Amino acid sequence: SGFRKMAFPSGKVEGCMVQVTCGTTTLNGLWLDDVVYCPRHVICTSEDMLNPNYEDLLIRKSNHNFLVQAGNVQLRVIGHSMQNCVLKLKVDTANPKTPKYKFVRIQPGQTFSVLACYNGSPSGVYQCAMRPNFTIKGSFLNGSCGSVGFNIDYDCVSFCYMHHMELPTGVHAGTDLEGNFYGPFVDRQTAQAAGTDTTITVNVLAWLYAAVINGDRWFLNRFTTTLNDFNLVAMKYNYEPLTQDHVDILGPLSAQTGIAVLDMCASLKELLQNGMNGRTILGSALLEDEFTPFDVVRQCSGVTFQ
Amino acid sequence: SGFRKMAFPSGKVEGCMVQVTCGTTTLNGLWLDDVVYCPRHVICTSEDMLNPNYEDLLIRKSNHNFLVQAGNVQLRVIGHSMQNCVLKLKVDTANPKTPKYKFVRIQPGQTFSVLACYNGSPSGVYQCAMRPNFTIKGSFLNGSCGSVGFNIDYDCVSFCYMHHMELPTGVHAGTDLEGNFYGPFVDRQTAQAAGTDTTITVNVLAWLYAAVINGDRWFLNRFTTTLNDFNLVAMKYNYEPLTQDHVDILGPLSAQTGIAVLDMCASLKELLQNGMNGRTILGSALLEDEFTPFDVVRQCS
Numbered sequence: 001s002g003f004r005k006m007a008f009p010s011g012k013v014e015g016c017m018v019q020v021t022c023g024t025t026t027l028n029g030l031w032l033d034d035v036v037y038c039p040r041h042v043i044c045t046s047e048d049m050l051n052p053n054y055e056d057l058l059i060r061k062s063n064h065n066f067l068v069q070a071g072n073v074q075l076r077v078i079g080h081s082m083q084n085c086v087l088k089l090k091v092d093t094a095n096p097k098t099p100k101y102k103f104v105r106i107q108p109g110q111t112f113s114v115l116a117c118y119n120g121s122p123s124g125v126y127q128c129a130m131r132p133n134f135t136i137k138g139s140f141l142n143g144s145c146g147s148v149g150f151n152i153d154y155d156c157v158s159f160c161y162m163h164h165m166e167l168p169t170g171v172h173a174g175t176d177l178e179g180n181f182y183g184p185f186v187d188r189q190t191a192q193a194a195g196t197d198t199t200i201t202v203n204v205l206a207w208l209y210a211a212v213i214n215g216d217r218w219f220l221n222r223f224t225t226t227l228n229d230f231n232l233v234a235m236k237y238n239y240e241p242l243t244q245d246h247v248d249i250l251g252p253l254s255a256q257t258g259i260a261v262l263d264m265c266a267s268l269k270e271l272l273q274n275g276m277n278g279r280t281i282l283g284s285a286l287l288e289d290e291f292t293p294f295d296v297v298r299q300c301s302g303v304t305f306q
Numbered sequence: 307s308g309f310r311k312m313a314f315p316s317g318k319v320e321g322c323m324v325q326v327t328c329g330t331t332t333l334n335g336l337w338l339d340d341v342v343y344c345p346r347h348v349i350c351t352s353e354d355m356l357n358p359n360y361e362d363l364l365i366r367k368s369n370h371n372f373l374v375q376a377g378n379v380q381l382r383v384i385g386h387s388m389q390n391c392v393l394k395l396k397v398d399t400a401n402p403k404t405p406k407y408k409f410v411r412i413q414p415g416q417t418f419s420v421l422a423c424y425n426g427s428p429s430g431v432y433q434c435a436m437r438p439n440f441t442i443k444g445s446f447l448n449g450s451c452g453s454v455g456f457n458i459d460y461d462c463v464s465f466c467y468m469h470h471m472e473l474p475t476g477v478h479a480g481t482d483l484e485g486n487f488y489g490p491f492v493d494r495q496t497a498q499a500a501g502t503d504t505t506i507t508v509n510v511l512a513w514l515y516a517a518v519i520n521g522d523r524w525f526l527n528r529f530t531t532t533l534n535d536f537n538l539v540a541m542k543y544n545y546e547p548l549t550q551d552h553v554d555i556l557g558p559l560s561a562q563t564g565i566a567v568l569d570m571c572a573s574l575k576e577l578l579q580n581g582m583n584g585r586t587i588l589g590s591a592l593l594e595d596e597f598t599p600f601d602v603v604r605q606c607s
């Protein structure tokens with residue numbers, strides 16, 4: 001038993017991280033097959049960032065302007081191109097440690113692991129969620145750009161995030177590996193801000209199920225509700241709507257614990273309307289929303305990766 | 307900016323995890339060079355566990371009674387020895403993925419990453435602390451034994467924990483990699499309650515410094531305290547004593563933020579007296595005690 005904020009094992013991703021330097025900027029790249037992916041803003045000076053014309057800035061660069069290092073070994077860049085907000089540097093050597101992988105775009109509410117890197121060297125791993133406002137609450141310093149987020153299924157790494165920037169409130173924004181930003185953010189030095197965020201209702205419910213599985217039951221009650229009535233409460237408390245698909249996804253946890261989703265929703269309604277009365281749930285005094293239903297099932301059943 | 311429970315990248319440890327089976331029991335082993343380390347209780351039946359004589363049980367085992375599997379490859383056991391509560395299985399193949407490593411026994415309050423594994427394969431990685439009562443608050447199921455805890459400061463893996471058991475209160479107990487248990491626990495099915503746990507004061511102070519570094523000041527105050535008055539108060543909340551060693555180790559964070567250590571202690575005293583009044587610190591509504599001073603410097607700088 002026990003329940004922790006748990007990341008995927010990061011080894012398959014560690015073997016893909018390299019250092020990319022253009023001019024005076026160093027950041028990280030992802031080396032898969034014979035291509036290194038990194039943020040396109042690596043090519044910009046500070047002045048360029050004010051109003052960058054990335055296609056003109058890139059024609060001005062040559063292969064030799066990009067220094068790529070895998071550990072102590074230099075990788076020769078033999079071509080370059082842009083895909084949306086990501087730069088693809090073709091190198092002369094395919095990464096012999098390339099795992100089975102795919103590029104996926106995730107939806108708000110979905111979680112993933114971040115391998116925070118500096119100078120091409122993995123430094124730490126932690127678990128995040130794509131917030132409803134399309135930011136992530138990361139932990140990133142200067143030089144972290146190009147660090148990636150991922151999930152694993154069996155033996156396949158699904159890369160879903162590449163890090164590009166920090167916003168004024170201290171949260172983070174980035175792209176999928178096809179270079180499309182999550183959220184209405186752009187890679188230029190102009191005013192931008194995180195929108196008002198909301199709480200990921202289906203994830204809170206999943207974590208309440210994790211709590212019950214781990215013996216924490218004090219918030220259970222005799223009451224149930226309807227999807228329509230609970231969604232009025234959710235809106236009042238800046239919680240995301242709960243859909244029938246969310247209810248269906250939580251079916252396994254309901255059957256296992258004997259607490260129907262709408263029964264658990266009546267628990268969550270009372271917690272929102274009345275608070276915790278000084279108690280905790282799974283060692284938290286807040287309602288945790290960065291575990292998905294699948295995260296709960298995975299951790300509580302001991303799923304492993306090959 | 308930001309502040310997360312951050313584990314070390316797990317790849318160097320993933321490359322060391324194997325499956326060990328003896329009789330009907332399967333757990334994980336750690337394969338370093340030509341040795342596989344695992345909990346010695348792998349050799350016990352359910353009956354053996356009340357009062358097992360491990361020396362007597364082990365002398366009866368042949369090398370072929372141990373099935374060791376590294377991915378899809380069976381490793382051949384060629385000898386075995388017992389060191390305290392760890393079994394060392396000598397195998398005929400050395401692990402080509404052995405990282406630079408050392409074994410370190412840690413003190414209460416120290417943190418480490420856990421790579422939770424089942425059947426020799428990794429499930430996930432999370433951060434833990436050695437509690438003052440020598441338990442860890444893990445996430446471990448049947449078959450997780452032999453999973454290890456570690457740090458990887460400066461490219462060398464320091465192995466500090468191997469998992470052996472869950473206690474009735476839902477926390478976890480295990481050994482260093484020399485097989486010595488942390489705390490009063492034993493690998494026997496006899497009663498062995500953990501002491502009342504306490505909060506790791508030096509770590510709470512480190513986390514308050516992290517909050518200041520990340521831009522929050524709401525909990526600061528104009529007061530200070532003597533060290534002894536702070537300890538007299540903090541102990542009434544089941545906080546651990548703060549020693550002069552702890553004050554010294556907080557010096558760099560104090561210098562970076564301009565908040566004297568004893569002034570931060572006055573902040574913590576007020577937080578214990580008042581609560582947060584609907585506010586949060588680094589996304590928590592509780593005082594967090596599983597980040598060390600070293601961890602804060604690692605992550606914020």
Ligand SMILES: *[C@H](O)[C@H](C[C@@H]1CCNC1=O)NC(=O)[C@@H]1CCCN1C(=O)[C@@H](NC(=O)OC(C)(C)C)[C@@H](C)OC(C)(C)C
Binds near residue numbers: 041307
């Ligand atoms: C790439 O390594 C780096 C990662 C950043 C540095 C600090 N923490 C991180 O996550 N990315 C950048 O430095 C990018 C390049 C353009 C500027 N930038 C930022 O992250 C800015 N953000 C910024 O200027 O935001 C707007 C004002 C454009 C909305 C950071 C460094 O500035 C603030 C003031 C810290 C937010």
Ligand SMILES: *[C@H](O)[C@H](C[C@@H]1CCNC1=O)NC(=O)[C@@H]1CCCN1C(=O)[C@@H](NC(=O)OC(C)(C)C)[C@@H](C)OC(C)(C)C
Binds near residue numbers: 001447473
């Ligand atoms: C090894 O894989 C396994 C890991 C355990 C299983 C459940 N969670 C874990 O962390 N270790 C064990 O099963 C060991 C072997 C002897 C029994 N044991 C336990 O962990 C017992 N603990 C136990 O008997 O504790 C005492 C009563 C002796 C203090 C667990 C499985 O039993 C309880 C009832 C869950 C505590």
Ligand SMILES: [Cl-]
Binds near residue numbers: 283284285286592
């Ligand atoms: Cl909390």
Ligand SMILES: [Cl-]
Binds near residue numbers: 411412413416
């Ligand atoms: Cl220590």
Ligand code: NA
Binds near residue numbers: 262
């Ligand atoms: Na109910």
Ligand code: NA
Binds near residue numbers: 353354357358
């Ligand atoms: Na016996």
Ligand code: NA
Binds near residue numbers: 410482486
């Ligand atoms: Na030791």
